[PDB]
């Protein structure tokens, strides 16, 4: 349902042991196939958290892509993620903390 | 012994915030085992250390971490506790006004009153009739100036019951026909009780009424959200006695329960006694360190 019919972007997370998990790799291959299907703007936006994960030893299929850094401070990562999102002209909605 | 007390007391005259940090908290690595027994440890608790410090410093910067909003507008509040100075003639006379809550339209006031009024007696505590009139009048003009009108209802906390004459004087300085009531709150009275089944103590928030006047409350159980006890052993409750006035027991009991989480100096979920009594207790030893000060400030940033 959602990955094909009702998805706009993607937020893969590159942890230390994220490469081991077979399910995340399977859904990653699904995302790669749907990107090969669409070819409109971009779908995949990686994230990096750990300090042990060196910038070169990242998952092999994703070496081609860069990553916004979170190793220093989460606030700036959230800030540049959000302003990149709003620059990408994603449809908006008025905020409501009550739902949260 | 009096290092911090003396330092803050004498620096109080220049209006400068300060914060004292022991090095062992900062350097808990290298102070390891001297001969096989580690001196010191914060591994298990390390993250919480940050939660203990940051917000406190924030308050010293001028920030408000969190405010309580379960107060009926147009009401009062006040507390009191005594202190022994034993300077020359072993005087017992040191009364430090704790605080007061006010609704100035939208905000909450947390400045309190000050002034260590004296008393010739050395062991009987209580208060001479002259000081009490000024003590209550002070809160009266504070309410007038922060309310642009007169106060409606007044509550008072205490620690010990007191004789008829000074409460009569308190009623004498009452403007119009406003209701005044004072409540005595002890700390320790033995009513140890157990749980019949399981291996856990009583669950926090219970009560046991013995009469329309007296009451009890428990504060150290274990919140289901925290799922873990607030005290290592079985707890000890707080005994409540109403001295004078016409006050309903349940409302005052829930009010005094609601004022045990405003511990700005920390961030623990629950605290035993209300903020007022301990708060006046911890301001008293600041002003008893050295008595040459005249008209100290009434903002608790510098005291804490």
């Amino acid at each position: 349902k959602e990955i094909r019919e009702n998805t706009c972007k993607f937020l893969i997370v590159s942890s230390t042991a994220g490469n081991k998990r077979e399910g995340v790799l399977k859904e990653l291959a699904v995302a790669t196939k749907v990107k090969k299907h669409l070819q409109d703007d971009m779908f995949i936006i990686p994230l990096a958290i750990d300090e042990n994960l060196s910038y070169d030893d990242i998952n092999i299929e994703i070496v081609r892509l860069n990553a916004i850094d979170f190793k220093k401070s989460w606030a700036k990562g959230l800030q540049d993620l959000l302003d990149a999102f709003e620059k990408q002209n994603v449809p908006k909605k008025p905020p409501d903390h009550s739902k949260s | 012994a009096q290092f911090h007390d003396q330092l803050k007391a004498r620096l109080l005259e220049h209006t400068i915030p300060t914060q004292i940090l022991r090095e062992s908290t900062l350097a808990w690595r290298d102070f390891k085992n001297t001969f096989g027994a580690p001196i010191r440890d914060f591994s298990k608790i390390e993250g919480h250390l940050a939660w203990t410090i940051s917000t406190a410093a924030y308050y010293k910067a001028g920030g408000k971490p969190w405010k309580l909003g379960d107060i009926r507008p147009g009401v009062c509040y006040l507390g009191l506790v005594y202190k022994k100075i034993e300077k020359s003639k072993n005087p017992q006379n040191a009364c430090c006004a704790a605080q007061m809550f006010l609704d100035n339209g939208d905000g909450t006031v947390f400045k309190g009153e000050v002034g260590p009024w004296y008393n010739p007696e050395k062991g009987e505590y209580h208060l001479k009739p002259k000081e009490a009139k000024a003590l209550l009048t002070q809160a009266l003009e504070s309410y007038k100036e922060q309310n642009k009108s007169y106060p409606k209802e007044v509550f008072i906390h205490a620690r010990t019951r007191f004789n008829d004459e000074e409460w009569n004087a308190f009623n004498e300085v009452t403007p119009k026909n406003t209701n005044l009531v004072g409540v005595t709150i002890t700390k320790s009275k033995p009513l140890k009780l157990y749980k019949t089944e399981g291996a856990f103590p009583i669950m926090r928030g219970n009560a046991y009424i013995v009469d329309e006047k007296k009451a009890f409350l428990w504060t150290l159980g274990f919140v289901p959200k925290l799922q873990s006890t607030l005290s290592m052993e079985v707890p000890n409750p707080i005994f409540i006695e109403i001295n004078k006035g016409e006050a309903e027991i349940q409302q005052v009991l829930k009010d005094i329960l609601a004022l045990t989480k405003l511990n700005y100096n920390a961030c623990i979920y629950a605290d035993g006694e209300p903020v007022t009594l301990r708060f006046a207790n911890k301001i008293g030893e600041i002003l008893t360190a050295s008595t040459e000060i005249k008209t100290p400030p009434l903002a608790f940033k510098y005291y804490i």
């Binding site: - | 004292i20 993250g47 917000t55 410093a57 971490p65 405010k67 961030c267």
Partner: protein
């Protein structure tokens, strides 16, 4: 038969007109009410105190993990929770006495030692506040 009446927990207010019971998760979710963002600070002590304070100050930016999550809510970061800047590059340090003429030879009447300590610290702080230009907000004192 005598029975126990139960009393429920109250609620505290937070930013955006939200409510909760615990304050930690509320701060992690909504933040404080008034926004103040200046922590230009001050410090006195010895140079090892300087380096250790710098290390601890710039360490807190990264999240630090408790041993047990279910009893202690997580701490992501000072800027993550408060929206206020506090770094280890804008301190105005004033040097402390190092000779410390007081030694094991001098231990009678420790009250005088305490008086000398407090006089030194207080005069240093007062002189720094009165004479210098930079606007300091808080003063941290560290000593073994």
């Amino acid at each position: 038969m005598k029975e126990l009446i139960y009393i429920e927990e109250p609620s505290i207010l937070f930013a955006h007109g939200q409510k909760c019971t615990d304050p930690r998760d509320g701060l992690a979710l909504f933040g404080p009410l008034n926004q103040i963002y200046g922590i230009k600070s001050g410090v006195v002590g010895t140079q090892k105190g300087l380096q250790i304070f710098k290390s601890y100050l710039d360490k807190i930016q990264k999240p630090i993990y408790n041993h047990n999550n279910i009893t202690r809510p997580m701490f992501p970061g000072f800027e993550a929770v408060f929206g206020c800047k506090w770094e280890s590059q804008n301190i105005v340090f004033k040097e402390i006495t190092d000779e410390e003429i007081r030694r094991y030879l001098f231990n009678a009447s420790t009250h005088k030692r305490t008086y000398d300590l407090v006089t030194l610290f207080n005069d240093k702080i007062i002189t720094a506040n009165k004479n210098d230009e930079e606007r300091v907000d808080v003063w941290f004192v560290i000593v073994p």
